[PDB]
Scaffold this active site. Structure first.
Site, PDB file in Angstrom:
ATOM      1  N   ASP A 240      41.238  77.219  55.641  1.00 50.51           N
ATOM      2  CA  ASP A 240      40.084  76.323  55.492  1.00 50.51           C
ATOM      3  C   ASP A 240      39.564  75.762  56.551  1.00 50.51           C
ATOM      4  O   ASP A 240      38.739  74.689  56.637  1.00 50.51           O
ATOM      5  CB  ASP A 240      40.556  75.274  54.502  1.00 50.51           C
ATOM      6  CG  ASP A 240      39.501  74.497  53.840  1.00 50.51           C
ATOM      7  OD1 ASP A 240      38.307  75.392  53.417  1.00 50.51           O
ATOM      8  OD2 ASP A 240      39.394  73.335  53.897  1.00 50.51           O
TER       9      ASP A 240
ATOM     10  N   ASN B 116      35.818  70.752  60.284  1.00 57.90           N
ATOM     11  CA  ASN B 116      37.235  70.224  60.676  1.00 57.90           C
ATOM     12  C   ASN B 116      37.534  70.070  62.028  1.00 57.90           C
ATOM     13  O   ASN B 116      38.726  69.950  62.251  1.00 57.90           O
ATOM     14  CB  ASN B 116      38.207  71.233  59.828  1.00 57.90           C
ATOM     15  CG  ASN B 116      38.230  70.850  58.176  1.00 57.90           C
ATOM     16  OD1 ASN B 116      38.001  70.088  57.759  1.00 57.90           O
ATOM     17  ND2 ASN B 116      38.864  71.985  57.492  1.00 57.90           N
TER      18      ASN B 116
ATOM     19  N   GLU C  55      45.188  58.071  59.728  1.00 58.52           N
ATOM     20  CA  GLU C  55      44.470  56.967  60.475  1.00 58.52           C
ATOM     21  C   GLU C  55      43.227  57.591  61.142  1.00 58.52           C
ATOM     22  O   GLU C  55      43.634  58.770  61.972  1.00 58.52           O
ATOM     23  CB  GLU C  55      45.508  56.516  61.707  1.00 58.52           C
ATOM     24  CG  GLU C  55      45.076  55.587  62.663  1.00 58.52           C
ATOM     25  CD  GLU C  55      45.974  55.243  63.806  1.00 58.52           C
ATOM     26  OE1 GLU C  55      46.826  56.245  64.056  1.00 58.52           O
ATOM     27  OE2 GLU C  55      46.206  54.081  64.422  1.00 58.52           O
ATOM     28  N   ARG C  56      42.188  57.169  61.093  1.00 58.39           N
ATOM     29  CA  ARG C  56      40.917  57.467  61.628  1.00 58.39           C
ATOM     30  C   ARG C  56      40.794  57.244  63.189  1.00 58.39           C
ATOM     31  O   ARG C  56      41.118  56.220  63.793  1.00 58.39           O
ATOM     32  CB  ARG C  56      39.687  56.759  61.153  1.00 58.39           C
ATOM     33  CG  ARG C  56      39.438  56.945  59.801  1.00 58.39           C
ATOM     34  CD  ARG C  56      38.236  56.315  59.064  1.00 58.39           C
ATOM     35  NE  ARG C  56      37.114  56.916  59.784  1.00 58.39           N
ATOM     36  CZ  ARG C  56      35.733  56.699  59.576  1.00 58.39           C
ATOM     37  NH1 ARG C  56      35.473  55.856  58.649  1.00 58.39           N
ATOM     38  NH2 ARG C  56      34.816  57.267  60.244  1.00 58.39           N
TER      39      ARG C  56
END
Lengths: 71, 426, 71, 426
Positions: free
Chosen positions: D299, D304, D213-214
């Site tokens: 990562d 991010n 979900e954005r």
DNA sequence: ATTAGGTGTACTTATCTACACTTT
DNA sequence: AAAAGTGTAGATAAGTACACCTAAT
């Protein structure tokens, strides 16, 4: 002059200007505010002080300070 | 119902109930947001009690037999406040004009005054005193000081009519050397750096008079207007009846001596909270007290101290009506406002002042500083003031000599015990 | 609700509310602001403190305080 | 020249100089007064440098061969930023739409997607091999975790067209058991009380995918619209080129190992000043770092971590793209952001953390608290997460077992030396 | 010769780093 | 198996007052 957010120094400056605006001696203003003039000097110069002192002088000189989605 | 006009602007309405005999005041929302009330006891929300409104309006009226002159022109009863205020509404103490709805005389004129017209009143036709005798017994404040509020352009005096208003107050003397007293005292105040109304001695015929510049009024050169600034005395500020002007409001009788419901120094200093700058206000008040103590003014009372009313808060006005009462022994010499429950100036010592400052919750050294500063500067100051005087006769000269001597005496007397003050135990 | 004029207490309360608004524990917020949580507790309760502390916490939590005749 | 549209409102203009090959951004006065900039490096006054604008725009583009896909549909050169943003302008990271003047196509409708259409894309190209690029890759830019940003109403998936935009991101797995990894990690984050995007596993045919979900997009039930909220990653916040996403931007080569021009933790925490609530931001970032350390995410890099842009200041977004790299030994295991100049997770001890917190000018006890809280909460948390999983086979079960074991191992390992931190001498 | 200052004891106080307490 | 909000204690450090004295104008 600063309408900007206040810091320890600019508060002391504000106090100092409000004091000088009333043409009050440091000793007189300090005494009336219930503090020694040395303390008032400390406050005006932005030096560290008890908040109570600051509020004593601020309340004394009648200075009011206030706190300042989807598309 | 009367409309409240400040300058050219209407700030609200004063309504009077004939049957109930009650007053009400309601303000325009514009004024509610951007403006200020008549006094602290008549807020913008319109919660002002009929009593406070009434007392406020009464405080605007003359306190002397001159009032009885207003009864001569007016056809109403003594108990009628509304008609009286309606009569003098156009020009009164403060900037407020009470105007019946839909009534304006904008276009009116000036009525120039030639000295003979002024001298004509000194003969006391159509004017007080009548009845030139004080008192029943021991005066004071009435009726021996006849006065006229007039428009003064710097040259000629004239009566203010319509929208125009008197920019100056001319005070004529009957009782001995009063103009010189107030002149020397006021100039002495100003010389000392105090905030005080400007005074000049003016001559009418063989009579001397004191011209006082109203600080609540400013005249504009180059056009026809008179700018008003609203003010209130301490009685109107504290919401006290005119009778409470003196700390003892029931008179000087030694039976009622213990009853003081009127304006005191504590009640005065309590108003510092409502001032824009409480410290400065208290400073002014303290210097006022000390100054009146040194110049021997026992008549300094509630209505002799006033404040500018502004949206941000009250501001103290320049001093006025400063007179040395100690000179005149036919008057009442006990202070209007006592020093720590002492109304006798001669009974004032380190104790009274110490307890006086302790009673205000202020450091004593403030009074020591403020007192020592003035009393030491007066000797050189009083000298400079005497030179500001016009030509005198021998009696006046003797009076000024007596004044100087008395003043210096008081200065020395006070300066004597100031050091004791710090170590006093109240 | 926000009261405009500030006093020693309402400032501490303001701080406390802004802190709890960020869902931060006292210890964490205090630590990040560079004070012991005890001091932060003193501040929140409106108790007397060094102005520097108040400004540390105020500047930390992104609270801005500002200075507010004729006719 | 392209116009900047935020929602239904035009907030300004992005002008491109073809000859000078320079970018410029200028804003409407309404937006200048009441609004907020694209990023801190492109102010409302329009003083944004061409460089920062360029880097900002580039940061919106795909970092993978997908870039070559947009080049396949657009047909332009790699060095063209304008055409690409012009192509994808309607839907990108953030709420900003870049619209040519007076041009709108869509008359927006829905284009429902049946699983077969998805399997067709899971099938060969539809290019996503993507190995071997180039080059033998390592760090998680390697290969393909094919994803598509799509509209999800809670039931059916559809392609977003015109003003409408994808409310969800559907991530398909090719490399072994990635969806389960990200699912467990994100759910583990959410369970621990961290601020993280909500994720749900969706099934297409026999293939599993992760629906994310954005948080920068919110759908309104009962009507057809998609509300966008503008955000910026740490690269866009710090004004760094996309290449600087990793602290070492020149690669893992032991020649360039000492050269770090990219995003570090210090550079990240430096952004706390621009946040509405710096403390909370620093808290979020610290917990982000510690969480990534405990879950073994190497990562976690510049792009991010993002911030909501508001007129009052920046706010940290929910965490996203949380994955355990320690599971896969075919990838680069060195942290994207080092702990006190240490990129090896296995070399992290009390010293590194002590110096790490000391480098941030923050108390160690804070890290001790935040670390100790999570590391003990993970064991009970990871259990609860496994129950959120759909039916599994033996391979997946073994993978989850290995994951759980590794996680617990890391937790214990860190919990082992955490106490030493206070007494460390840097 | 006044205001904005720096001294000096003696005094009172806030700050810090832990431990342990009362309630979730 | 706590968590967050409280207080306690010695120890460090620092503000306040109170009055004397300085440097300029």
């Amino acid at each position: 002059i600063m309408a900007s957010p206040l810091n320890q120094q600019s508060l002391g400056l504000l106090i100092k200007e409000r004091r000088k605006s009333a043409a009050l001696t440091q000793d007189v203003a300090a005494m009336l505010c219930g503090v020694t003039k040395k303390t008032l000097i400390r406050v005006e110069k932005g030096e560290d002080v008890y908040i109570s002192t600051v509020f004593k002088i601020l309340d004394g000189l009648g200075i009011d300070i206030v706190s300042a989605g989807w598309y | 119902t009367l409309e409240m006009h400040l300058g050219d602007l209407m700030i609200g309405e004063l309504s009077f109930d004939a049957t109930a005999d009650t007053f009400a005041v309601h303000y325009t929302k514009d004024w509610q947001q951007s403006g200020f009330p008549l006094s602290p006891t008549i807020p913008l929300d319109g919660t002002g009690t009929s009593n406070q409104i009434s007392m406020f309006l009464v405080n605007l009226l003359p306190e002397n037999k001159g009032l009885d002159y207003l009864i001569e022109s007016l056809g109403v009863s003594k108990g009628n406040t509304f008609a009286l205020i309606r009569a003098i509404g156009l020009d009164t103490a403060g900037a407020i004009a009470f105007v019946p709805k839909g009534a304006l005389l904008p276009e009116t004129q000036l009525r120039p005054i030639k000295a003979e017209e002024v001298i004509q009143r000194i003969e006391d036709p159509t004017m007080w005193p009548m009845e030139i005798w004080d008192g029943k017994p021991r005066l004071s404040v009435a009726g021996v000081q006849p006065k006229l509020n007039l428009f003064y352009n710097g040259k000629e005096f004239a009566f203010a009519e319509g929208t125009l208003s008197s920019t100056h107050i001319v005070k004529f003397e009957k009782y001995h050397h009063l103009v010189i007293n107030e002149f020397i005292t006021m100039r002495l105040a100003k010389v000392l750096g105090m905030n005080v109304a400007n005074v000049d001695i003016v001559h009418f015929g063989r009579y001397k008079a004191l011209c006082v510049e109203r600080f609540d009024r400013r005249n504009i050169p180059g056009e026809q207007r008179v700018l008003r600034r609203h003010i209130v005395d301490s009685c109107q500020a504290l919401g006290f009846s005119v009778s409470k002007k003196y700390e003892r409001n029931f008179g000087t009788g030694r039976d009622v001596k213990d009853i003081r419901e009127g304006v005191s120094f504590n009640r005065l200093f309590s108003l510092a909270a409502k001032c824009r700058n409480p410290v400065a206000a208290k400073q002014d008040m303290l210097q006022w007290a000390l100054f009146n103590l040194l110049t021997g003014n026992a008549d300094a009372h509630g209505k002799n101290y006033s404040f500018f009313m502004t949206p941000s808060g009250m501001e103290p006005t320049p001093w006025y009506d400063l007179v040395s009462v100690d000179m005149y022994e036919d008057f009442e010499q006990q202070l209007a406002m006592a020093i720590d429950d002492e109304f006798d100036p001669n009974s004032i010592y380190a104790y009274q002042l110490a307890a006086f400052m302790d009673g205000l919750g202020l450091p004593r050294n403030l009074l020591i500083s403020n007192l020592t500063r003035i009393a030491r500067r007066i000797p050189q100051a009083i000298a400079e003031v005497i030179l500001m005087l016009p030509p005198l006769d021998e009696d006046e000269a003797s009076f000024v000599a007596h004044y100087k001597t008395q003043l210096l005496a008081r200065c020395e007397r006070y300066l004597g015990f100031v050091d004791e003050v710090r170590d006093v135990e109240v």
